[PDB]
Amino acid sequence: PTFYRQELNKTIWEVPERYQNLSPVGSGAYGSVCAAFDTKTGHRVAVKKLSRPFQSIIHAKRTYRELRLLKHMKHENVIGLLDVFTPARSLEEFNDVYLVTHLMGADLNNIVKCQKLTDDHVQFLIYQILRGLKYIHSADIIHRDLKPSNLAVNEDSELKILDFARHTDYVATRWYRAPEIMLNWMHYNQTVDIWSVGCIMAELLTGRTLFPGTDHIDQLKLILRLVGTPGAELLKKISSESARNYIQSLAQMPKMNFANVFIGANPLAVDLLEKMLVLDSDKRITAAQALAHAYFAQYHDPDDEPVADPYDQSFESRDLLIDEWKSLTYDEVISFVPPPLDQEEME
Ligand SMILES: Nc1nccc(-c2c(-c3ccc(F)cc3)ncn2C2CCNCC2)n1
Ligand SMILES: CCCNS(=O)(=O)c1ccc(N2C(=O)C=CC2=O)cc1
Ligand SMILES: [Ca+2]
């Protein structure tokens, strides 16, 4: 294919002539994104140019990680790949990676900002998050930083999870993070993401951030004001003695009845929130269980809530050289098989 060059976000993009009318639509994890028109199919796409993918051992493994993950994700509520390309003609020239997915116009913050959502609409939005989470969790993939800005949404309220790192190479919101993540507790499970769903859903119902803490201690205090002081057994999860002593020293707070907090909400929504927003992560409802909850009765369809194929993450424990990660990434670019344009059939 013929490539052309265009300066976007102050850097040269080099893309096949198949993709036209590129214009920036913001940054993603380790990359920046442009909307484009795919002249082969007439579809609107988003193209992410990875930022400096092989600049360091951290970037190189992150690049491989992201490409492997996105090549595996095949679910209507999870960002996956229509195409992956590089202007490189060989491994020796290979320094840039572009990922292509269907264009989504907005994020969840654009949905709830200027609209009092109906309960039926909130149901649909949360349902889709949970359906996507069931799929990713079934492949032993945890998001760990689920939040409205990591939920891409189109003009019809269809939603996809994205941006789901080992090493430190921007100030992120922590308001949606599970307590065990935010405070670095020693162990956690897939239900970290269910806490985040609870935080998101609460905000869709009230129009207000549930736990808008100014720092991690203020956020913890806001959380405990809602869910109540936890037992000693939760201290078992916390390595730092200073942290444990502090939590233990706090004045004891009762759990609030969520029906007194979410005034006017559908009682089924309140019940679901009670099942998601619990500190005991082993008692937190799972994504698959939440999909069966009566709150989603009008959307739930067990024939259309699939799980993922097994996902081999053994590479995560390996230290390889930068050129080895680069070569493996090149292999994954070259081996990518685009999906059919139409992959769905009437039920
Ligand atoms: N507009 C739009 N549409 C779809 C996805 C994205 C996208 C991607 C991304 C990921 C993989 C890929 F192959 C192509 C793009 N990464 C971050 N974003 C965000 C850009 C700003 N927030 C909303 C989504 N943006
Ligand atoms: C963070 C809650 C603090 N309490 S609040 O800000 O006053 C409040 C705001 C909105 C609601 N609500 C629902 O729950 C459903 C419809 C609706 O109006 C309830 C409470
Ligand atoms: Ca259906």
Ligand SMILES: [Ca+2]
């Ligand atoms: Ca079809």
Ligand SMILES: [Ca+2]
């Ligand atoms: Ca069916």
